[PDB]
Structures are given as structure tokens and as C-alpha cells.
Amino acid sequence: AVKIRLKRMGSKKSPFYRIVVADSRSPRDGRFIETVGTYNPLKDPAEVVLKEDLVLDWLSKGAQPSDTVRNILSKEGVMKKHHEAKNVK
Amino acid sequence: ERNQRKVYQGRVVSDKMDKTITVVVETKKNHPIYGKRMKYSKKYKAHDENNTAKVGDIVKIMETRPLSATKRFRLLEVVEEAV
Amino acid sequence: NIESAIKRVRTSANANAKNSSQTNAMRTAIKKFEEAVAAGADNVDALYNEAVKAVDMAATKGLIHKNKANRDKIRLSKLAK
RNA sequence: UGAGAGUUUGAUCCUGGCUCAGGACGAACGCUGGCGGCGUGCCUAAUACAUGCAAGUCGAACGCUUCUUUCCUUGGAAAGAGGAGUGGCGGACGGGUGAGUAACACGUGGGUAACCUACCCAUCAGAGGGGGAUAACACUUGGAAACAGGUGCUAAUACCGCAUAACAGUUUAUGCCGCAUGGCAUAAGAGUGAAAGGCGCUUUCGGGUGUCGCUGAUGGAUGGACCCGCGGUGCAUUAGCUAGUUGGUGAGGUAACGGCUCACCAAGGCCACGAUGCAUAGCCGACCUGAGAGGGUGAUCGGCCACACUGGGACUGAGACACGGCCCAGACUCCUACGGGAGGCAGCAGUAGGGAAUCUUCGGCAAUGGACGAAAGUCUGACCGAGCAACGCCGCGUGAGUG
RNA sequence: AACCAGAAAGCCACGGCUAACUACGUGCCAGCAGCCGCGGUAAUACGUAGGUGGCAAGCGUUGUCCGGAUUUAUUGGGCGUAAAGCGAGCGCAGGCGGUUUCUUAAGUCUGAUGUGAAAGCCCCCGGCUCAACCGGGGAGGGUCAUUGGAAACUGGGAGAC
Numbered sequence A: 001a002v003k004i005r006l007k008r009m010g011s012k013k014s015p016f017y018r019i020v021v022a023d024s025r026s027p028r029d030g031r032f033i034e035t036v037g038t039y040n041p042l043k044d045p046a047e048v049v050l051k052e053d054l055v056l057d058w059l060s061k062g063a064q065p066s067d068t069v070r071n072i073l074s075k076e077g078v079m080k081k082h083h084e085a086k087n088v089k
Numbered sequence B: 001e002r003n004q005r006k007v008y009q010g011r012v013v014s015d016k017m018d019k020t021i022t023v024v025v026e027t028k029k030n031h032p033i034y035g036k037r038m039k040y041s042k043k044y045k046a047h048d049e050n051n052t053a054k055v056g057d058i059v060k061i062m063e064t065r066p067l068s069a070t071k072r073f074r075l076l077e078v079v080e081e082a083v
Numbered sequence C: 001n002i003e004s005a006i007k008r009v010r011t012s013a014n015a016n017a018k019n020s021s022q023t024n025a026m027r028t029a030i031k032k033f034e035e036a037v038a039a040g041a042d043n044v045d046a047l048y049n050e051a052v053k054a055v056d057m058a059a060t061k062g063l064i065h066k067n068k069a070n071r072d073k074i075r076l077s078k079l080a081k
Numbered sequence D: 001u002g003a004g005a006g007u008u009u010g011a012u013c014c015u016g017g018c019u020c021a022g023g024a025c026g027a028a029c030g031c032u033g034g035c036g037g038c039g040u041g042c043c044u045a046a047u048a049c050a051u052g053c054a055a056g057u058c059g060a061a062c063g064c065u066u067c068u069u070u071c072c073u074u075g076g077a078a079a080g081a082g083g084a085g086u087g088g089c090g091g092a093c094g095g096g097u098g099a100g101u102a103a104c105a106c107g108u109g110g111g112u113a114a115c116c117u118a119c120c121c122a123u124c125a126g127a128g129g130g131g132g133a134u135a136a137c138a139c140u141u142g143g144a145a146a147c148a149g150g151u152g153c154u155a156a157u158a159c160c161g162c163a164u165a166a167c168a169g170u171u172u173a174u175g176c177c178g179c180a181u182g183g184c185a186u187a188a189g190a191g192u193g194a195a196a197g198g199c200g201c202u203u204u205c206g207g208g209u210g211u212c213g214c215u216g217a218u219g220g221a222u223g224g225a226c227c228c229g230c231g232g233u234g235c236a237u238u239a240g241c242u243a244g245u246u247g248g249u250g251a252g253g254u255a256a257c258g259g260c261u262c263a264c265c266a267a268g269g270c271c272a273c274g275a276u277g278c279a280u281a282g283c284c285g286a287c288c289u290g291a292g293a294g295g296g297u298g299a300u301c302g303g304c305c306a307c308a309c310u311g312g313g314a315c316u317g318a319g320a321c322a323c324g325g326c327c328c329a330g331a332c333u334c335c336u337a338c339g340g341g342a343g344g345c346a347g348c349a350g351u352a353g354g355g356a357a358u359c360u361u362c363g364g365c366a367a368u369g370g371a372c373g374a375a376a377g378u379c380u381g382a383c384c385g386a387g388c389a390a391c392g393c394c395g396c397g398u399g400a401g402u403g
Numbered sequence E: 001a002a003c004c005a006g007a008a009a010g011c012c013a014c015g016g017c018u019a020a021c022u023a024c025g026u027g028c029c030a031g032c033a034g035c036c037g038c039g040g041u042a043a044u045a046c047g048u049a050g051g052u053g054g055c056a057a058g059c060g061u062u063g064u065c066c067g068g069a070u071u072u073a074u075u076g077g078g079c080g081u082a083a084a085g086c087g088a089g090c091g092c093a094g095g096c097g098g099u100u101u102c103u104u105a106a107g108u109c110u111g112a113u114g115u116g117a118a119a120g121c122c123c124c125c126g127g128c129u130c131a132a133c134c135g136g137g138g139a140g141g142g143u144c145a146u147u148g149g150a151a152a153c154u155g156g157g158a159g160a161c
Helices: A056-062 A067-076 A078-088 C006-039 C046-061 C067-077
Strands: A002-005 A020-023 B026-030 B037-041 B058-063 B073-080
Touching: A002 A067, A056 A078, A067 A078, C006 C046, C046 C067
Parallel strands: none
Antiparallel strands: A002 A020, B026 B037, B058 B073
16 A cells, blocks of 8 residues: 655755655654655755656556645656556557 | 576585485685685585495586475586595 | 553454454364265265365355465375275 | 883893883772763673553444434424444554574675565556355353353445456467577467445436556566575684485476475485584774774674574465564463453563663653645654763853053 | 833852962861861951853752773783793694696676665755754665676695605
């Protein structure tokens, strides 16, 4: 039950997150599999820097993004391209 | 064969047990602090079918799977035997 | 302390009752079969075949998980002749 | 990228010890004590623990008890109301602690033609239909209680058979890697399977459909399990150790190979390249130091292993031989009308005790992260923050030009 | 944003090593000290005085680990007299070996490929008004693992002097 989600790396009051794919059994800041992009909480608009050969080729493997991660990665229309293009078959 | 095993050479010490030989591979290391070429030895136990090799033969063997109470390699080929 | 795990005690006890009952039924079926094959008297095949088929009916309803039921039918097929 | 001073003598050169100048601390102890930005805080007794909070949630498989509403004013459709369950999923994650362990426990490098895996994308037939028996509730029995019995009702995705899958596995047939055993594709020989099922739309016929399931069995993803080469400790004032031990044959058993376990046969196996024995110790990323080779340590943060008062044993469950779950034995402690009962601070605060010495019996899911749930919500001493301490680093201060 | 340098500085030593002083009452007693050593009218080692002398909310003391220590010396030590060649021989195991032809390639070096988690110590660049926090790169984590080559030297086999 892999699940791409956040990882809090702040100092004391100023956080900094990295979008990362980890199994749900693992803790909030424990291990993972790989770091797929990042996001400052601060400074809207903060960048979604990606290779994006990972998200497209990773939800297709079968994964479920959480609340914040999906609702910011919908700004590139990622899986809609994909299950649009499952008609390629 | 989509993945290789590890094959080892060596010679035979003693094979008084049925279907079973004893293979010694042998090389030289360094001392970790000092530097000369110390030599040492191991004694494997490899499985044989039908009493192929004898005492003193250079033979070679392959990693197989857990086959018994720790005798775990399979004989390949009697290479060089003397009397 | 106990909070809600006492539900699971009753659940697991009832599961013990029915699981042990059905598996003892399976074991006595296999025992009846193996005593039938070693007999070798009259009706050496027809009650044998009815016993084989009742054993397999009991086996696939049963649980090991799935694997050693097939081992049971392999070691059971070789016990024909 | 490598700095040397003091002290043996009446004075000298050698050799040789002792001591100092440099850093570092989970430190302590005396003196001093302005503010803020980041951290850290039982190293001793894994000693005994009062008190309060650490894990629940569920209508769309399901059914039955308890509120207010216009409820044909006697019961009333209908909305939110529901105690335990045929009843699912969670409680094997998340947090603690280093007592054990000198071995495949760890670190690297590899294997599995000897392996298992609760959601998603699907994958060959699908996606059979039919049937039948029971708790809560009501009455009663013993006791103040923890609680333990009878008589009567009901619900289904529990129960039942029944033909519908051999692609399980075997034989045979047909093409290659080998690593011998064997396995990888196509068709046949003999045996076998189940959840017969929900909320909504249209409802012309009296059933088409959107969100939901179960397989005869496959694939990916994830997690777990087995097995090998090499490496990291002191003692010879510790030199022999081994009898399921070492091999074969057959059977059982396991997620699978295997003395893992049995029955039989032969006496094998390990050792100076340090076995066996005694003692100490969790391992690693790393940290301090040094020119470097090295030496020392494994507390903050991350990964693995092992433990739940002490010692055994299984069950449910995909997953535990289960932190909190069950059963049994042992030590301790508590309540009572004395007949009987109850429990494990190595969760967060806190208590005695030890010690030279280490904090508050606070707020809240606003945020990130779980668990349940069509979805709002619900749980959270995870976590986010406020306390306390000069314990460490600091950004600084108590103006600049002046008389 | 209206007004102030007011509200707002600390601590141990001075005989040599040890940069960092002079003088006064104390009198082998009371005392000091890391080592050397000081005390009987001098303590330039108790108190006083101004000084002097040190980092930037600190400063001394105790305890523990590395350096200096070439004082376990592989890098990097020695044995006539200073510690140190057994009283002397015979020899199992072990260590090390004359010249040369061919040959294997264990040791040897090298090309390519895979990995050496994240965070650290580094370096470059940004923000945090400078400590701390994050970001991308690289030696950094092997005596590693597989695949291809050399036979100069030592192992190994066949011979030769």
C-alpha cells in the first residue's frame, strides 16, 4: 500500500517539505523508496520541481497520493493524461 | 540460465562418506596491519552422485541450494587425477 | 485493562470451535480412507472411489492455505495402486 | 599535510622515566549571573510503582431495543435517534528500552530450476442458482458485586449439498537452458470450486443501468522468509571437542530445500589457519582526535536485531508464537460482608529508592502522519507548541567623534 | 511609530616552565604546590594596595578519551658495557631460497558495468538582516561483485645446467 506524501524537515517554525513515496507502515520521517520532488510550504507559489518521468511512471505502477500531494500535482494533469491514454491499450 | 551462480575450483582431501567429497579452495591474503602473503584453507563439503572422484583430484563445484545438513555444492568435472 | 479486545476473545473462541470441528471431520475422513485402502477385501474400488471423492470434497473446502492440499492429493493419488 | 619546554650532575654528553603547554564532554562542583536565535536534559536500580490520560471506528452484506417532530386526535409513513451481534476492518503500525546474543545477530556482495504476500491496473470462463437451522430482547435461578444457567424470536456476505475450473498435480505427445534433480510453451488421460450478493436512476413493459463482490486461477507493485563468500574481542596460568553428532535409504511434516522429526544401515565430523571452555559486549550510518597510518566511543537523528514482572504454550488472524490479547506455573502487591476477586510505568507527566548529578501529575488536532467511514466526523501523551535548567553553541549588547 | 545612553558587564593568576609587579604588617608555626620546591624577622607563595595579564556571560576545580609519546617503532626503535643472544647441540611442523626453455595465470595491474540509504564533516551558489535551515553537484562510503586483456616477478606443471 505505497502512498506518496510529505516529509517535514523544518527548523523550529519554518517547515520545508519534500514529496516522497513511502509505505504507510513507515513513520512520518523514517525510510522511503525515493524522493519525488519537493515543496516549500512557505512562499506561494512554491515550486513543484520534478523530473516527472517518475510520477507518470509511478501512479501507473499503482500508488495513491494523499490529500495535499494529489491536489497540487493535479496542476499538471498527470493521471488524466494517463487514463485518457489507457485507450492506447 | 538467466542468472549465474559462483563456481569454485580446488582439490580433494577425503571422501570416506557416501556420495560426498571434500573440496579445499586455497588462496593468499594480506595481514591487515603487516604485509606478507599469509596462506590459509577451507574445507567445503560437496555432493557427488556415484563415487566419481578420488583422493587428490583437482575438481570444481557450483553453489546449489541447501541440500543436506551442510553439504551444499554439486560436483562438476573430474579434471586432473593422479594415483 | 480491557477496552474492546474482549470482542476478539469471543470471536476467536467460536472460530476455535468450528475450525477444530471441521478439521477433525477431515482427519477422520482421511483415516477412514486409509483404513479402507489397506483392507483389500471385497469392494476394494467402489467404496474406495466414493471415499476418494468424499475426501477431496472435504479437502478443498478445508484449509492449509492452498498448497499442501495439492501435496495431499499427490500423495493420495499414488496410494491408489 | 608532521614546532617542544621543565626535572638525574660541582658542572658535561648519552639513555631513561615523571610532568606541562592543545583540544572534546548527555558532565558535575564552587564564584559570577542582562536580553534574546537554535539545540540538549536518569549515563546509576531492565529497582518497586500511588494518581490521571496512552486505540478505536463503522449502513451500501446486515437485522432486532432507546428521542423529538404535521406524524388520517387512538398511533402515525417519513428525517436525524441505535445495546449487544450473524459483522467488517483495525488493534503484528505508531511510540519505548539495550537485559540478553561471540552467531549468518550485523555490514557488504550475491543467490531463490527450493518460497509466501490484506489495496490498485487488469487478466482466460466468468460474475451458478436453489435450500435450511441460531444471540441480543422477555421471563426466571444463585450472590451486594465481578458475574455465571434455563424457556421463547429473528436477521445475513455464517451453514448446506448440488453438475457447471483443470491451467493443481501426474502421464504421454510435441521445442531449449542447464544447475545434476529438472524446468519453460500446446493438446488430451482422472479427480475436484464459490458471495445463491448492496445504495441509487429510469421504473413503457415488470428489468436495463451508475457506485459495489467472489473465485477455477494469473501479472505487476509492496512487505516478509531461507541460504552462502568476506569483515569486525580478550585469555594457552583455557588443548582436545562431538552420539541426531557426519553420510546414505524410506516415511512424516513445513510457506518450500534440509536429521527439521522419526525408523534402519556405516562410524563419521571439527581442530595450531586456535575448535571447545571462561569473561566482556547489542551491530551500523556516524562522532571526537591525529600530519597520516591509527586510537577511543556507539548518548542526540536515521537503518537492523532483540525484550515486555520471571519462565513455558498455543489459538484467532494473510501477517504474531502477539508491548498492550488468551491459558498454565513462580515472586510480589491490593479490595471484601471472608464466600471470593484483581494487576504489571522498558507509553506521557509524576512518585519513593539509588546517585556527585538530569525537567511540568500543561494547551490543541490550526498544520504534517496514521486507523475506521459512501462522505461530514471520530480517536491520538504520534505530533505541533508553551513551561524548567547558563547544560552547549551563539546574534548581540551596556553608541560613534569627543571634553 | 513619540523619548534615553539612561533600564543594561563580567571572572582567575603574577619564584622558573608561564607572556602576564611592586611595596607593605605574617614569622621552619600557620600554610602553598601540575613538576622543580618555598616557610626561623621578608611570602616578590597569608591579607592589603594600586596595577598587571587572559576570552567576549562567563571563570576556575574534579573526572574521562586522543595528541605531544619514534614511550610497542608496518610507515617509524633496539640487544659489547645502560633493560635486553637461551649454557650448548640434533632436528618434526613452519618461514625463505642457485641459472634457464616452454606453459597455467593463484597472487598483479588495468578498461567497462552495479552498488557503497537519508542526514553529517567538505566545496560552490541562494535565501535565514550574520550563528543555525534547506536546495543541486562532486572524490566521500570496497580487501567490494561481474565481464575483457599482461605473463615482467613470486606460486604451479613439464623439462635443461
